[PDB]
């Protein structure tokens, strides 16, 4: 279904635009114009994707779910508009009177001076405030009874001609048809656009006729007449299914009415003082509503409240440009390569699994005797997503959310995805990654010692006479390409404790390269080399 | 980035709508109105998602790629519009003349009757066709030199007051500001909506002022004056950054101009005969363009050109409602359960792999000695997606496309996904599935015997004294739920050869249930029971 709606719109758009082009030049250079029927052509073009004819010469589900509901909604609504206008007119048909022979004479003169066909019907009523038409298979034409009396300024002459032109061209009907089609074609709002364009042009063609049948010195007053027919009426742009002088929802119209309504009034400044402040408070209330923290959309840029030194490790990053953060527990000092980049937030990928698993451990979901689903050491060493998918399913989401909040987990965005950190909604900077892991063991008072240590052992990479190096990689691979070269970890040495996070964005930003890069950096910096 | 743009729009929308509500009632019941500043409020609300402040009380990549490009595009464009209007005015400023004391007297009277502040500037020129303003930090006010001469109908009195009201309220500037903001805020088309609303209302408030400072019997002519200022001018709605009587792109405007242009002309009927047919041919050309075969979007509904009998197997489907097709090679007859449903097209899921693998065999990509990547029997028996993902990567896509075409593979839609049949773009009915597989072995003359037989052996399910039953399951599991219970296959018996396809849509439409259902049906129908 949706593809048709979509492509129907496409069809329309294309055609429409082509036509408009012609419209553009016909008018611009020659004051010529498209025969409006082309808009049917347009419609038809809009309709024809339908042909179930094989002619030639990603979760998409919602696309159709939406298309289906939107459409049915539109049609009942638009149908309602239709029947109301229809009824108005049909009911009005009941109220439509025949003309006196000495009234009929004028109307007939206007049209049949050109021997126009008589397959139309002329009626009048006191219930007609302004010229209006209907169809009923008869092309019902209606004029104000007051206009039948007021046949002394010949506005009516002009009006009828205008109305006639609509009639010659069967405009009433064309519109009716279009509106009906528009209802089913409503998925394309442009049905109204074109409806409108048509109307505009219908009137233009009418104007052409008018001019075609009048003198050069009448052209002027006609234009004035267009104006009189709007100036002198409320702009009750009511008949959405026909024509009337006031049939347009716009500015001049609004303004003129306000003058009609000019019984001078004063709003207590308080009326608007209240509304404006209230609203402002309501806008403030929108601000109170999750103002969409640009801070959260933005990659982290808060100043590291902690000291620190800026590093230059560009030689090691080399072919895989990125950023890197290291921290000394003894000195409470950070060492940061490309701080602007270090502060950038990226989805954690598989490295988050350490948090997921350790949360399961603290909450007594996952344990040592029952670290299995593989065990935790195997699962972590081989990144077994299955193991971890179950762990998320087995941990109350609120436990996880609580920890995200308590220990400042980046943007703490849990998304809606059970594995939201896996190239999805949760994002964290390298700086934040270091801060959080360090605090996880050093400060977290809502997390057991066993969970801290059990997790730690599963991450050992290498060791020597100075230290034990722990960590975890992950690769942000999307649609087969590398985007996030993650490696995180910590070092326990015989003199200090260090925390760190590496992220590659350029070159081949794989988790493996991040591991290699981090180790090389940490060694050169003394972390893995005794300083 | 995009989230801000999106949510900014949301902000706007909300606020806007709230305001409009008030607008609605203030006007509807009391003829009262929002102080336009609320639209700044709106803007601001639109702007504030920006606050990088954490205040409170799926391939998304494209979302931001798009947001980024769209925005930069919009701003250079809108900036261009701005500078042009600005320049027009600044250049015009160069052309703006001072008034004669005996001209100045009138302008000053109009404003300072109310002791309005004099921090404005009044100028004139022959280059002013209609009233217009600028800012320049001075609130430049411009009137036609002809209006300075034509100070005898007091239109100018009315105009200035109108202009003044804009000035009292610093409208020129407000607009300027908005437009500038609108440029950066352009991602929200509603900036123009509100711009416009503001303008509309700016004029309304001006009208309020006018009325506030005039008599009841002047109100009328003012309205007439609004009209005169539009009636008597080309609607060159040019100054997108200011106000003028003609400053609106609409219908009445277009019509009136055409009258000005009324040097009667006739388009050779051919002008439009050509354009209309050409266009029609262009619409036909759009029809020539992939008319989006609704036939292709639609599930298969072509009549089975072959005979057939309709079945009732609803008892077996039972808890898992669906459809089923069986075919007799000897009789060239089909047996169909719920034909309307049998004809429905579904993505093949893993059952397509038989085609993928056999294509690799014929094209000499995959073979017997080298059926491995697992071998083919293991890969097929355990549905090893990895095996099959590589097979698609290793087969020229055109080979596959050729076979889709030659043997009528449903909608033959290869999508863009290397595994397009795996709950993606390729879809086939059960009827089509039977037709295609049967033809694959029976008719396909662009496919070797070895590929046909090698594939066949890998599908054996069960056998007895009457037959060998072959087939393949697959489960349309999406976001963890079952949607497509596939099982396809064929039977080689000692009396006939049969082909079939089962699909479940309701209950638990798993591949396993489809296997069980198919076998049970085939046995009851005599296929797997000697008849
Ligand atoms: Zn009309
Ligand atoms: Zn104005």
Author numbering:
A (entry chain A), B (entry chain B): 1 to 57, 97 to 412, 428 to 585
Sentences reproduced from the published study:
β-Lactam binding to the extracellular BlaR1 sensor domain regulates BlaI cleavage by the zinc metalloprotease domain in the cytoplasm. BlaR1 forms a domain-swapped dimer, with the zinc metalloprotease active site accessible from the cytoplasm.
The structures of BlaR1(WT) and BlaR1(F284A) (the latter alone and in complex with ampicillin) were determined using cryo-electron microscopy (cryo-EM) to nominal resolutions of 3.8–4.6 Å. Thus, β-lactam binding and the consequent extrusion of EL1 from the active site appears to trigger movement of the sensor domain towards the outer leaflet of the membrane. Notably, a general compression parallel to the membrane normal was observed in the BlaR1(F284A)–ampicillin structure. Careful superposition of the reconstructions onto the re-entrant helices containing the catalytic HEXXH…E motif clearly demonstrates that structural elements on either side of the membrane are compressed towards each other in the presence of ampicillin. Central to this is helix α3, which traverses the membrane directly linking EL1 and the metalloprotease domain. This helix is bent into the membrane at its N terminus in the BlaR1(F284A)–ampicillin structure, seemingly as a result of the force exerted on EL1 due to the acylation-induced sensor-domain movement. On the inner leaflet, concomitant motions are observed, with the metalloprotease domain drawn up to the membrane in the presence of ampicillin. Although a range of states exists in all of the samples, the equilibrium is shifted—BlaR1(WT) is dominated by a more extended conformation and the BlaR1(F284A)–ampicillin structure is more compact, with the sensor directly in contact with the outer leaflet of the membrane.
